[PDB]
RNA sequence: CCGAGGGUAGGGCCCGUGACUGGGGCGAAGUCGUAACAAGGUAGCUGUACCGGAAGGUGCGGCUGGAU
RNA sequence: UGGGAGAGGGUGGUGGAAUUCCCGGAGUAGCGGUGAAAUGCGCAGAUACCGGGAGGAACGCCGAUGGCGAAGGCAGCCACCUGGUCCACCCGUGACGCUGAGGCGCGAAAGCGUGGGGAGCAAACCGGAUUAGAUACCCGGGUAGUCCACGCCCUAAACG
RNA sequence: CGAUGUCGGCUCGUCGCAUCCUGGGGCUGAAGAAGGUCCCAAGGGUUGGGCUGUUCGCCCAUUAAAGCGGCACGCGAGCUG
RNA sequence: GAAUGCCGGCAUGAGUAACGAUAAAGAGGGUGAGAAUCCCUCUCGCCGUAAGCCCAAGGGUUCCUACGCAAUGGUCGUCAGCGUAGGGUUAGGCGGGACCUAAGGUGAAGCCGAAAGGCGUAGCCGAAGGGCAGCCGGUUAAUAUUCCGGCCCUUCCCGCAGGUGCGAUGGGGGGACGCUCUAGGCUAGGGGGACCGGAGCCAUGGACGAGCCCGGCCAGAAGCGCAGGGUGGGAGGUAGGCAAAUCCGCCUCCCAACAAGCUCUGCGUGGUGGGGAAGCCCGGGUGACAACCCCCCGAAGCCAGGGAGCCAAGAAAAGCCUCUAAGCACAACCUGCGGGAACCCGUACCGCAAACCGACACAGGUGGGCGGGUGCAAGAGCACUCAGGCGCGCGGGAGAACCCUCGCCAAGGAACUCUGCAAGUUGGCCCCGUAACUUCGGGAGAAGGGGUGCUCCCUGGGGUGAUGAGCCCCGGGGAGCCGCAGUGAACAGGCUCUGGCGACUGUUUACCAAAAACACAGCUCUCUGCGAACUCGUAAGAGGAGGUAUAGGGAGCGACGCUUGCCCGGUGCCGGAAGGUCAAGGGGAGGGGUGCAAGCCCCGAACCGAAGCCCCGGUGAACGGCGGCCGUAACUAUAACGGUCCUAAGGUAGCGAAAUUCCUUGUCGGGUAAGUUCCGACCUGCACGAAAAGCGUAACGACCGGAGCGCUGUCUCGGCGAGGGACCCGGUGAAAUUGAACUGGCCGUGAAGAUGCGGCCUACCCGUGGCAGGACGAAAAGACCCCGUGGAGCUUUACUGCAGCC
RNA sequence: GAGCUAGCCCUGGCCAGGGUGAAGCUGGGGUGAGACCCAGUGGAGGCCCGAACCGGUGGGGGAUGCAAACCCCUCGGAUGA
RNA sequence: UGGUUCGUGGAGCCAUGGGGGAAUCUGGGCGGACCACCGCCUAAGGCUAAGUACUCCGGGUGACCGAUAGCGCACCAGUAC
């Protein structure tokens, strides 16, 4: 039946995107953390 | 007249619709319409702040002229009377001799082909707008301003009217559609007549669906809910109220007055409503 | 082919009967009251309506077939 | 053809008297009610009196053993629409008449539907009395209803 | 109680005997036929149906008879539910 | 050495279950070390409103070719969506961007908030909506509306010519809109042809035929024709369209008007350019100088912004036209022509799926378009079948039990069982015919019945033509033929009677409940006069509502019919300028500390002092409540009547063993041979009762009872048969579980149910198919129960506080 | 975190075929005029049957599945909340 | 109201949201309610090294680990998944 992942590229970028993260104090702190942690990808890779 | 239907489905058995007999033009005046932003009852936070709204027919907003003192002395011809989905009253198309077109809410009796006008010297006839201080005491009037130059606020619903009861200094005293007696300022505009479409109140929606068309979503009893939801919620089986009957938010709802006590307009309301 | 009749199915009228039930007539040796007949002790009667253990009462309107 | 009288009917207006409630004033110890009372109302200022206002209903005098209508019935005043009817003239038609099973319409009150309206009154209902008792009569309250529009009902001591 | 699935039904039996029937018998207020009562006897048999979830029970129609109990109130790694 | 410990490794179950739709396979040839599994051929089967084709998402090289088979593939593998490499995606016209706006987002101005931050008319962003110029064919291994060919077109720059008061982000028009139904004419698509073109065929008894088989088109500027859409023209006035305006609006007059004209589109034709079958030879050649014509059917598509009707009353903005303003009028703009210029991103491939979402090459899920033919009344249904695509990535045998799915069944026919659960029956269309009751619609497909194929003859009307022929549509009457049987296969209601509940269509516990629950039209109460009440928010600001009491909020009740009684003492709400109580504050009689003092500092009675509470009244479709005892009537029984206690008042109408009745299977009646259910009644209602509505009610219901007919393998009571498993052989190969085990029966014993202890009995070793009594079998640290001064949701006249309100 | 699910907002799309036959309108009849009656026309509706589509009633199967909610049979809605 | 050891306490001090509201050395604050005396100190403007905290970084050193340890990572790890 219909499961829960229904990929959509726009929805992915508008939601978890680099610009989304920057727009918010909380989202910018995700970036602070993922950077401090050495994440190779700070933001979901998405094809564009 | 209201229109009946033969019971050829279970709902048509009780459904009645308006007759639209007064309607002479079936399309709005393009420069006087604008889109209505449908809300769902949600405010700017996204939150429902008024329950059970949504999903009705689409509507264009007809811009109504609730000022009228805007064009004193310039008469207009009543071009057409039209359906207006944003109100119970029908609306009248005015062709001012000026060439400007506006809408007003259509008084009972307004005839297409006839002329109307606003100002201190306007004849006391149906469709005309004047300051209250120039209208003969006893005449019934609608679309009344509450404060000068602030726009019609009183008696706008299908069939409503206020009646001028007397005067007192700068104020006249109206009997509002509720029966409340209020001093309104003499300088406030009002239009002689009552609002039209007085049979509106006798319409029988007839089926769940017709409320649905009106953008009215199903309303659910506190009783049919649970305690997290509502004071009346829960209890095993059906239950009586078990406390003074309350709103979802807990305030009592059979009798408790709610008008703010120390309100400035109290000074101007002479008698609270009837019945 | 038609055809007595037989069979199947659904209807109409009539009669008998039925747990129970509604009043009716009568009986009379009873209980409760006294509604009408006298101005019958609230004039009566009345159509309707609501009401009361019961005759009845009251409202609205009517008639006199009402005494003083 | 010319005249008449009349609460005959329908619509729209519109006047004053009274009751009730609200507002202002002034005033104090009761008012009210009955056969007599009590309930009730009143010092949280009633009753009675003055002025202002709101509202509904009915139209005193004229008024009658009166008038009009087929009946039910119809009463302040005004105008409009409209019926019946009588008189005078003896002009017109030439028996074109009477009644009338069915049918159709109208039909007091109460009642009913939808919507108004609601001052007074008042079934139901509450209470006070009366009484042996008193689901009554009498007293204080009181909701339908009474009023309007539209649709029903179709009764009557609808009686001369 | 770090789980021994719980009523009734179906299915499948198996056992006890304080025996319902059938076999044997004593007493009888046993003429006969039919019964009563006790004794011996568990080999076999012990019906179909209406009601109710019912076990039980009542009822219809039969029968030689329409027995009563145990088996984790036998049987849910066998079914039902 | 244990912690259902942690990490890892390896066992057991076991060569066991399984190998993922029961659409299905067989053979010959090839290749190779190796072949059921790869290639080729023939035969067979399946899909075909798809299981074919095209788009969009998502995916991201999976595409094509070469070389490979360790692993991945549920088996095999020479194959592959796999390994290695190489190649492959070409645009002014398709899509998106350099265009517009939608919700929403963001946000100059501005507002608000301890900080972070929240709002916010403009503006900006934002599309699968608006706007906008490309069709047909050819070509590659692999791209093509992109390359090529042919025929068309758009914008920008410049220039030339002609024209005009040119000019805009400002004014106006327009863009521009619903749902249902729908006309005319077309087109797409399709059927037929005795006509045209075609390789060929005559079998097996007949046919050289009006035979069979195959095809009979596509695109196309201007012009032209047909069908539609849009649209009045002139003049005068003018105070409105936040400047101006010759525009638009408004008024007046004249001419035009189911005309035209003008204009835009669709379709036909149209210079031209293309395609072009079967079959036969090895994707290609040929067929072929291919033919390319006639008739019928005909859209849901087009003309379109068409038409009617209806109520619930149906986006914006730009492009575009027009008007004028600063300006500028050697400019500029329009029209025509000519030359030049024309950017960025996508484009492979999968795409109902082995490439997307489901850990899997997963019987699940995934939006849009196309979706042929025949028959069945119609259809996107059903059967078969075209194009096209498949046989589902283990097979071969066997022919037990048992299970699944399926077919039949003597006599019986619900006796089955909680229940006809399940399966039968019924079944489409046409005609006849159809009850109670009813809100007059309905109930209704009630029920019940008849007809149904083919053949010949006669005949009626319609469409297309031409009025006719041909073609297509809808019939009627007659005579006959065959079979068990004619909706001959497939798709396709069993019916009736009677109760409960809920009026009704709807909604719901995604994944144990679809219901009588929720909703619902409708009824009532109540708040609310508008900067409304109310809701969200600290606020600003929003919703309410660009609404205004015929409106909005809250609450209960629940279509409709007839109704909705009594109790206001308690609680709630409403009302009440009195009175009582009443906080801070006011007041300051009186008193105290200290200082030599002036002074400084502290306590403090009367008295004034809000809401709230008390108090007075109202109020029930506000929370709620709605009795007991004794006596009494011509025989018994009962009690209309009386008395008495109590209460705020003592249950009205209606209903009643009920979705409520304990006793209970109450009693009586009905139905059955038999009725704890069911229906009708009665009424000592344990413990109905009037908007937590009462009693009814036609119609409706995958709701829950009871009965009957019909028909049945439900059953007496079982049998046979089919296929998929089970079984055997080849291939691959799990799982929970497992202290170790060399793991019998009885009677006892034992922590009270023993393979493991005692005594006896029995018993050679080891498996395979089976059954489920036991290993207190497995799973899950019982969910019940209790315990823990454990948790959490919920309530209130528990306590205490906070928001909020006063 | 609303790419699942729930509600709402903006913009699009979809719903084979068949049946019943409301209002209105036209004509006839009726009447003083009317109501109204009949016929034809019309094509309404939380109308009917039934695909797509949306569901999930009953039963069977599945139950270390094809699947962490599936399959077959049956069944509800299918112009509308 | 907060701060202090000070939780309303005999509650001063420092700070301040509300109200009231001065003076310029004969001015003002303080020494734990208050008063006197005796003393201390000069509010309502600002700056100011050092001594102090830390360890991403470099180095030195371990009665620290030695690949299940030691950092999550000795290895291409904040990776695969
Ligand atoms: Mg989706
Ligand atoms: Mg996307
Ligand atoms: Mg997208
Ligand atoms: Mg998205
Ligand atoms: Mg972003
Ligand atoms: Mg990196
Ligand atoms: Mg992130
Ligand atoms: Mg109706
Ligand atoms: Mg009607
Ligand atoms: Mg109906
Ligand atoms: Mg109905
Ligand atoms: Mg109207
Ligand atoms: Mg009207
Ligand atoms: Mg419109
Ligand atoms: Mg516009
Ligand atoms: Mg708006
Ligand atoms: Mg917003
Ligand atoms: Mg709300
Ligand atoms: Mg809402
Ligand atoms: Mg309107
Ligand atoms: Mg209306
Ligand atoms: Mg209403
Ligand atoms: Mg609407
Ligand atoms: Mg509502
Ligand atoms: Mg509700
Ligand atoms: Mg409920
Ligand atoms: Mg509930
Ligand atoms: Mg919640
Ligand atoms: Mg709570
Ligand atoms: Mg609560
Ligand atoms: Mg409750
Ligand atoms: Mg309760
Ligand atoms: Mg409840
Ligand atoms: Mg309970
Ligand atoms: Mg209960
Ligand atoms: Mg509940
Ligand atoms: Mg309760
Ligand atoms: Mg209650
Ligand atoms: Mg209570
Ligand atoms: Mg005001
Ligand atoms: Mg015979
Ligand atoms: Mg008497
Ligand atoms: Mg008398
Ligand atoms: Mg009595
Ligand atoms: Mg009485
Ligand atoms: Mg009379
Ligand atoms: Mg007289
Ligand atoms: Mg004469
Ligand atoms: Mg009458
Ligand atoms: Mg009357
Ligand atoms: Mg009446
Ligand atoms: Mg008389
Ligand atoms: Mg236990
Ligand atoms: Mg266990
Ligand atoms: Mg066990
Ligand atoms: Mg159990
Ligand atoms: Mg003997
Ligand atoms: Mg004998
Ligand atoms: Mg025996
Ligand atoms: Mg034995
Ligand atoms: Mg039994
Ligand atoms: Mg029993
Ligand atoms: Mg015997
Ligand atoms: Mg036991
Ligand atoms: Mg047992
Ligand atoms: Mg058992
Ligand atoms: Mg079980
Ligand atoms: Mg059992
Ligand atoms: Mg077990
Ligand atoms: Mg077991
Ligand atoms: Mg078994
Ligand atoms: Mg140990
Ligand atoms: Mg373990
Ligand atoms: Mg372990
Ligand atoms: Mg472990
Ligand atoms: Mg095994
Ligand atoms: Mg196995
Ligand atoms: Mg498997
Ligand atoms: Mg397979
Ligand atoms: Mg199958
Ligand atoms: Mg092979
Ligand atoms: Mg091989
Ligand atoms: Mg092959
Ligand atoms: Mg992927
Ligand atoms: Mg490719
Ligand atoms: Mg391999
Ligand atoms: Mg291999
Ligand atoms: Mg190999
Ligand atoms: Mg593999
Ligand atoms: Mg696999
Ligand atoms: Mg090879
Ligand atoms: Mg592959
Ligand atoms: Mg090109
Ligand atoms: Mg550019
Ligand atoms: Mg924009
Ligand atoms: Mg776009
Ligand atoms: Mg083109
Ligand atoms: Mg290519
Ligand atoms: Mg020009
Ligand atoms: Mg412009
Ligand atoms: Mg518009
Ligand atoms: Mg649009
Ligand atoms: Mg074409
Ligand atoms: Mg065809
Ligand atoms: Mg002008
Ligand atoms: Mg060719
Ligand atoms: Mg050639
Ligand atoms: Mg806009
Ligand atoms: Mg550029
Ligand atoms: Mg491409
Ligand atoms: Mg599919
Ligand atoms: Mg997942
Ligand atoms: Mg596969
Ligand atoms: Mg068929
Ligand atoms: Mg068919
Ligand atoms: Mg296969
Ligand atoms: Mg075998
Ligand atoms: Mg049989
Ligand atoms: Mg039978
Ligand atoms: Mg039979
Ligand atoms: Mg049954
Ligand atoms: Mg069939
Ligand atoms: Mg019947
Ligand atoms: Mg009928
Ligand atoms: Mg039939
Ligand atoms: Mg034949
Ligand atoms: Mg089939
Ligand atoms: Mg059917
Ligand atoms: Mg029936
Ligand atoms: Mg029952
Ligand atoms: Mg229902
Ligand atoms: Mg329900
Ligand atoms: Mg009902
Ligand atoms: Mg209902
Ligand atoms: Mg419903
Ligand atoms: Mg659940
Ligand atoms: Mg569920
Ligand atoms: Mg769940
Ligand atoms: Mg389920
Ligand atoms: Mg459910
Ligand atoms: Mg259902
Ligand atoms: Mg529910
Ligand atoms: Mg409900
Ligand atoms: Mg109701
Ligand atoms: Mg709030
Ligand atoms: Mg705001
Ligand atoms: Mg607004
Ligand atoms: Mg509003
Ligand atoms: Mg409900
Ligand atoms: Mg009725
Ligand atoms: Mg009573
Ligand atoms: Mg009370
Ligand atoms: Mg009270
Ligand atoms: Mg209480
Ligand atoms: Mg006083
Ligand atoms: Mg003092
Ligand atoms: Mg109480
Ligand atoms: Mg209550
Ligand atoms: Mg007696
Ligand atoms: Mg009873
Ligand atoms: Mg009984
Ligand atoms: Mg009952
Ligand atoms: Mg119950
Ligand atoms: Mg009860
Ligand atoms: Mg019982
Ligand atoms: Mg019982
Ligand atoms: Mg018994
Ligand atoms: Mg039963
Ligand atoms: Mg039962
Ligand atoms: Mg009894
Ligand atoms: Mg309730
Ligand atoms: Mg109830
Ligand atoms: Mg109640
Ligand atoms: Mg009932
Ligand atoms: Mg019913
Ligand atoms: Mg239902
Ligand atoms: Mg149902
Ligand atoms: Mg069987
Ligand atoms: Mg067979
Ligand atoms: Mg077989
Ligand atoms: Mg077989
Ligand atoms: Mg062998
Ligand atoms: Mg061992
Ligand atoms: Mg033992
Ligand atoms: Mg042993
Ligand atoms: Mg041993
Ligand atoms: Mg032994
Ligand atoms: Mg076993
Ligand atoms: Mg077992
Ligand atoms: Mg054992
Ligand atoms: Mg066991
Ligand atoms: Mg644990
Ligand atoms: Mg435990
Ligand atoms: Mg436990
Ligand atoms: Mg316990
Ligand atoms: Mg404790
Ligand atoms: Mg303890
Ligand atoms: Mg605790
Ligand atoms: Mg807690
Ligand atoms: Mg409040
Ligand atoms: Mg849209
Ligand atoms: Mg549909
Ligand atoms: Mg109608
Ligand atoms: Mg019409
Ligand atoms: Mg329907
Ligand atoms: Mg239907
Ligand atoms: Mg189907
Ligand atoms: Mg199912
Ligand atoms: Mg079934
Ligand atoms: Mg199962
Ligand atoms: Mg499962
Ligand atoms: Mg299925
Ligand atoms: Mg079906
Ligand atoms: Mg429906
Ligand atoms: Mg249907
Ligand atoms: Mg529907
Ligand atoms: Mg202390
Ligand atoms: Mg202190
Ligand atoms: Mg301060
Ligand atoms: Mg000093
Ligand atoms: Mg000083
Ligand atoms: Mg200080
Ligand atoms: Mg100091
Ligand atoms: Mg100091
Ligand atoms: Mg220094
Ligand atoms: Mg320092
Ligand atoms: Mg290692
Ligand atoms: Mg490191
Ligand atoms: Mg490591
Ligand atoms: Mg690595
Ligand atoms: Mg990572």
Curated annotation (Swiss-Prot), chain A:
One of its GO terms (molecular function) is structural constituent of ribosome. The keyword Ribonucleoprotein applies. GO terms for biological process: translation. PROSITE patterns: RIBOSOMAL_L34 (PS00784). Part of the 50S ribosomal subunit. PANTHER family: LARGE RIBOSOMAL SUBUNIT PROTEIN BL34M (PTHR14503:SF4), MITOCHONDRIAL RIBOSOMAL PROTEIN 34 FAMILY MEMBER (PTHR14503). Belongs to the bacterial ribosomal protein bL34 family. This is Large ribosomal subunit protein bL34. It comes from Thermus thermophilus (strain ATCC 27634 / DSM 579 / HB8). The lineage of its organism: Bacteria, Thermotogati, Deinococcota, Deinococci, Thermales.
Curated annotation (Swiss-Prot), chain B:
One of its GO terms (biological process) is cytoplasmic translation. GO terms for molecular function: rRNA binding; structural constituent of ribosome; transferase activity. Residues 222-275 are annotated as: Disordered. It comes from the Bacteria. Pfam families: Ribosomal_L2 (PF00181), Ribosomal_L2_C (PF03947). The keyword Ribonucleoprotein applies. Gene3D superfamilies: 2.30.30.30, Nucleic acid-binding proteins, Ribosomal protein L2, domain 3. One of the primary rRNA binding proteins. Required for association of the 30S and 50S subunits to form the 70S ribosome, for tRNA binding and peptide bond formation. It has been suggested to have peptidyltransferase activity; this is somewhat controversial. Makes several contacts with the 16S rRNA (forming bridge B7b) in the 70S ribosome. Part of the 50S ribosomal subunit. Forms a bridge to the 30S subunit in the 70S ribosome, contacting the 16S rRNA. May also make transient contacts with protein S6 during translation in the 70S ribosome. This is Large ribosomal subunit protein uL2. It comes from Thermus thermophilus (strain ATCC 27634 / DSM 579 / HB8).
């Amino acid at each position: 039946m219909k499961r829960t992942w229904q990929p959509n590229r726009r929805k992915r970028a508008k939601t978890h995107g680099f610009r989304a993260r920057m727009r918010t104090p909380g989202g910018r702190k995700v970036l602070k953390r993922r950077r401090q942690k050495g994440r190779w990808r700070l933001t979901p890779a998405v094809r564009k | 007249a209201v229109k009946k239907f033969k019971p050829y489905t279970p709902s048509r058995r009780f459904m009645t619709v308006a007759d639209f007999s007064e309607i002479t033009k079936t399309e709005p005046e393009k420069s006087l319409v604008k889109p209505l932003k449908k809300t769902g009852g949600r405010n700017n936070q996204g939150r429902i702040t008024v329950r059970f709204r949504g999903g009705g027919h689409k509507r264009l907003y007809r811009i109504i002229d609730f000022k009228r003192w805007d064009k004193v002395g310039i008469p207009a011809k009543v071009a057409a009377i039209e359906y207006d989905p944003n109100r119970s009253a029908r609306i009248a198309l005015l062709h001012y001799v000026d060439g400007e077109k506006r809408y007003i809410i259509a008084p009972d009796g307004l005839q297409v082909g006839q002329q109307v006008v606003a100002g201190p010297d306007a004849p006391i006839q149906v469709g005309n707008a004047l300051p209250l201080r120039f209208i003969p005491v006893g005449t019934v009037v609608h679309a009344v301003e509450l404060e000068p130059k602030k726009g019609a606020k009183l008696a706008r619903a299908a069939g409503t009217s206020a009646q001028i009861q007397g005067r007192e200094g700068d104020y006249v005293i109206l009997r509002l559609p509720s029966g409340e007696l209020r001093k309104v300022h003499g300088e406030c505009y009002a239009t002689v007549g009552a609002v039209g479409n007085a049979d509106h109140k006798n319409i029988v929606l007839g089926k769940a669906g017709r409320s649905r068309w009106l953008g009215r979503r199903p309303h659910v009893r506190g009783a049919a809910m649970n305690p997290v939801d509502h004071p009346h919620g829960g209890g095993e089986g059906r239950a009586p109220r078990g406390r003074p009957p309350a709103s979802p938010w807990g305030w009592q709802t059979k009798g408790l007055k709610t008008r703010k006590r120390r309100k400035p307009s109290s000074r101007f309301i002479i008698a609270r409503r009837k019945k």
